[PDB]
Amino acid sequence: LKDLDLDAFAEELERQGYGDKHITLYDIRAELSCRYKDLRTAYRSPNTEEIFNMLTKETPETFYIGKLIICNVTGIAHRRPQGESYDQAIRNDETGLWQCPFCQQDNFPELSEVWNHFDSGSCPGQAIGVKTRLDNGVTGFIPTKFLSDKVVKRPEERVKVGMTVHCRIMKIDIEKFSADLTCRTSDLMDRNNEWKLPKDTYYDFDAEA
Amino acid sequence: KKFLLNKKPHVVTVAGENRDAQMLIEDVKRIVHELDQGQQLSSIGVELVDNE
Amino acid sequence: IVKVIDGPHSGREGEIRHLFRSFAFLHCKKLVENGGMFVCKTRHLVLA
Amino acid sequence: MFYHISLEHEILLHPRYFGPNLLNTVKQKLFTEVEGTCTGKYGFVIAVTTIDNIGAGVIQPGRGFVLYPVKYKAIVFRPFKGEVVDAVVTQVNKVGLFTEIGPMSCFISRHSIPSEMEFDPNSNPPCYKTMDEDIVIQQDDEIRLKIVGTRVDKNDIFAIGSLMDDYLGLV
Amino acid sequence: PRKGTHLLKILKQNNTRLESRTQLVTMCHMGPKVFMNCAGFLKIDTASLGDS
Amino acid sequence: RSIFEMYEPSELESSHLTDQDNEIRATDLPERFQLRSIPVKGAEDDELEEEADWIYRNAFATPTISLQESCDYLDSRKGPSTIQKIKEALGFMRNQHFEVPFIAFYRKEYVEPELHINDLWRVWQWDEKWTQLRIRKENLTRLFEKMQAYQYEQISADPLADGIRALDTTDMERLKDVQSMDELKDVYNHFLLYYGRDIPKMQNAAKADMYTICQSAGLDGLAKKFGLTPEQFGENLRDSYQRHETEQFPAEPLELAKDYVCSQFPTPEAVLEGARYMVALQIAREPLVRQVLRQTFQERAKLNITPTKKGRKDVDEAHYAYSFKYLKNKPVKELRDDQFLKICLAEDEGLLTTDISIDLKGVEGYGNDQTYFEEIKQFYYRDEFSHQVQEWNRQRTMAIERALQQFLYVQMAKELKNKLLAEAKEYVIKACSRKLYNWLRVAPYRPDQQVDENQGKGIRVLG
Amino acid sequence: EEDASQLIFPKEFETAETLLNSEVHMLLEHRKQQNESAEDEQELSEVFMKTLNYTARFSRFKNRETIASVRSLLLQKKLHKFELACLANLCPETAEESKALIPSLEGRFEDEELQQILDDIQTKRS
Hints:
The structure is cut from a larger assembly and holds four copies of chain A, one copy of chain C, one copy of chain D and one copy of chain G.
Chain A (H helix, E strand, L loop, with lengths): L5 H11 L5 H11 L15 H9 L11 E12 L10 E3 L4 E3 L11 H10 L5 E8 L5 E5 L20 E10 L4 E5 L2 H5 L15 H4 L1
Parallel strand pairs in A: 5-7
Antiparallel strand pairs in A: 1-4, 1-6, 2-3, 4-5, 6-7
Chain C lengths: L1 E3 L7 E8 L4 E4 L9 E4 L5 E2 L1
Antiparallel strand pairs in C: 1-2, 1-5, 2-3, 3-4
Chain G lengths: L10 H4 L6 H16 L9 H10 L8 H12 L6 H9 L4 H7 L9 H14 L2
Helix pairs in contact in G: 2-3
Family (chain C): Belongs to the SPT5 family.
Subcellular location (chain C): Nucleus
Protein name (chain C): Transcription elongation factor SPT5
């Protein structure tokens, strides 16, 4: 059928008295080639954004950067020591005893005890952040620097597992279903309106004030 | 694994309720890989479908 | 019994039935809209 | 139609309200209670005009709650069948014409409305035109109507009308 | 829906499959315009048809 | 006993057995054409041409007031040839009784590449709209002839009162030229203004308000002597040119009154107030005046929003109305998508209050402002320094200010609000439709074909 | 059975006091004027606002003196109480009109006897 001339047939039809039929004849030819071919688009696996919006029920409008959310503390991340960096122990004078810089425990009688602690594997490491869960299952990481306006050493100094905390979304990662968050009171208040959504171009800030 | 090896469907789908769908799909894919190791099957394929 | 002088239902009165992280379903008998029941944020409330 | 009658109601007062403003609290409670309510016997009460007298409070046994039977002269709005009242058209829709009978809102249907009143939905403000125009029943217009049926939906009055007349409505 | 149900009911009462589109005009007594409208959208899988 | 006397009407209609269902199954024509509200009658070439022109004008040509981005995943403005294409499509839908799918598939050569299946559905809808419009215009014409005959009869009954205005091709032509329900209701109101009390007596004899207060007290004469007529004023408002010199009566208005004092208007001041109300309502309910002012609104309509305590406290950072709880003069041209629908929802919820005004609002630098009221004042003013002319000009100024800010700035504002709301609703419907389209265009699953009976019988799946 | 057209109402309502549009309007207005004063008071409700903006658009005579005069010249007849408020609020044009309005007037009084009353009412109107 690919070698047949359909334009001549269409012209013949027009001269006979059927009107224009170029498209009708071409459709009949395409039909003879694979009768009823499902014109529907082939199946495709849901992409990353589709999977996220599907098994989380979130969308760019409901879940976006700068939004306030209410998460729950769940876990803590730490930075464990090295292999031979045990000579960094410091004789903390506030307690008059040796102290490890990884766990910040100033209660070791001697550097030998510090090395024994290192070897025993009881050193959890220097805390990095706090892990939280959102109502939609997304995970939330709050680095120690973004845990509050005031400087904090370890998470032991604020909140703990099983506490509800209001945080603000800084960054999102869809492939991992995670969000780098922050609960600093400065950010929650938004002093300079840095995280709030953009307002209309014709907003009346004067009337608001 | 018994049910799959006995019936042998062409594709498995999982409801997308929450994030547990990730673990379910991972498990189905691990089962499929273990069955394809010895060539018990020939790749059935696992997908995630909206359950609305 | 909690009053709502301002918010999604200003000058409104109703008993609370259900709470949420940031919502509260108030129920009353004087209202007619929605069979006499509305919703408003929790922090936008006052202990009457 | 609005009227002025004397009703009675018993209200309990918690012992905490005792003091020099006891009568004031009773009157305040009566106002907050019998205002804008509705009962299947007297209808919908708009407001209270005055209070005849405050009955002698009877302290209940084993309960600090003392009940006062107060009689108040108040106005009530209880529309009956057959009455004709005024109202302002609120909206015109192809399903019917909407109005506002004070504390009540009626609704008229094309079947009752004459055969001349066709529809105009393509325009921004829908309006029933008596076929050849000559009289507008759009929004914010004083129209009368005859209450051919009444109804109280749990303290909510809603009557129904008809239309195919000209001399109590808009001329 | 009303005509689809009527056509399916006629087919069930006859207890015969739609062997050809000309049946819609012969046994179903479908109108000429209705036929012109619904003729090129009813597939009659002659492969699975088999016998007539 | 029949099955209808036994079975429940619900089950009967679910099973489809009523006389209506029997008629739908028996009668020819597609079921969706028989079920349409308005019948689907024939159409000659004369009507088809005008209908195709009107459809191409109101559906595909006339843009949207709001910034509605053209989104058509099925597929960019069309051209004149679409007129002939719509003509052919509408001919197939009416004369031959062919539905949209058939015309899109087996008659694509007469609709493409200008019209697709969605465009054909739109043409079908506008076809129902045009059928309604034409039917109601013909009705109007018939009974307008009847009303003219009735007025002629009342006149032949016996100097006619000025309230009994005569009309003819002046109004018949306006009716027959109406191109939309907007102008239809404009002619409706025009006719009510002059003859608001004739349907009663007319229908009574056939079967056998405040303006009315003005009409009964004799204020019609003072209204006529006032000055320009509504028609002349409307032409002036349109052309921005005093093509009709303002007339003047040999007497001040206050002194010309008095004679019309009658109880309800006990003083010449009351008579002047009644006459002013009458002239203002005349200027408001006039076809040409309303048309010009509607165009001016669609072209110039500044939007403002004010939140009450309700909205001030509710609309927080997470509320949906956070991006437009305070607005100060926002051209309606820049309303994007369903933003206006959300504003109306917030208003219905009592959170916000909208205000659509032809003029600006709260502009500190008022230099070279010039409001629409001040612009039209020149169209009715007289250029003379006599005390009588000054008094008449003050009276006319009051009449125009009233006619505007008590009728037109409200009616047209509500009309523009409804049009913007309808456009937002149309956007929401298009969004839902293209989402259902993405859902249904998915094809069945298929295994790794790169590697017969299973496909013939369908693939087996485990959910 | 309750049909004002045939003059019949429950026993509790038969002994009611009829109210006019202007009367209820001035009553609600006086109530609002008394309530707005004296700070620390529960403001009005939607019912009062709608009733106010409903009765204000139907004040045929704002003068309490005119209200008194009209009710006095009306009560001198032998019509029931129901016939006092409906007619006082409607204010039709002619006697045939009023009779077609209220079917009870059909054959109850004379055409001119009612025409004079309608004219008096329209004149007393403001």
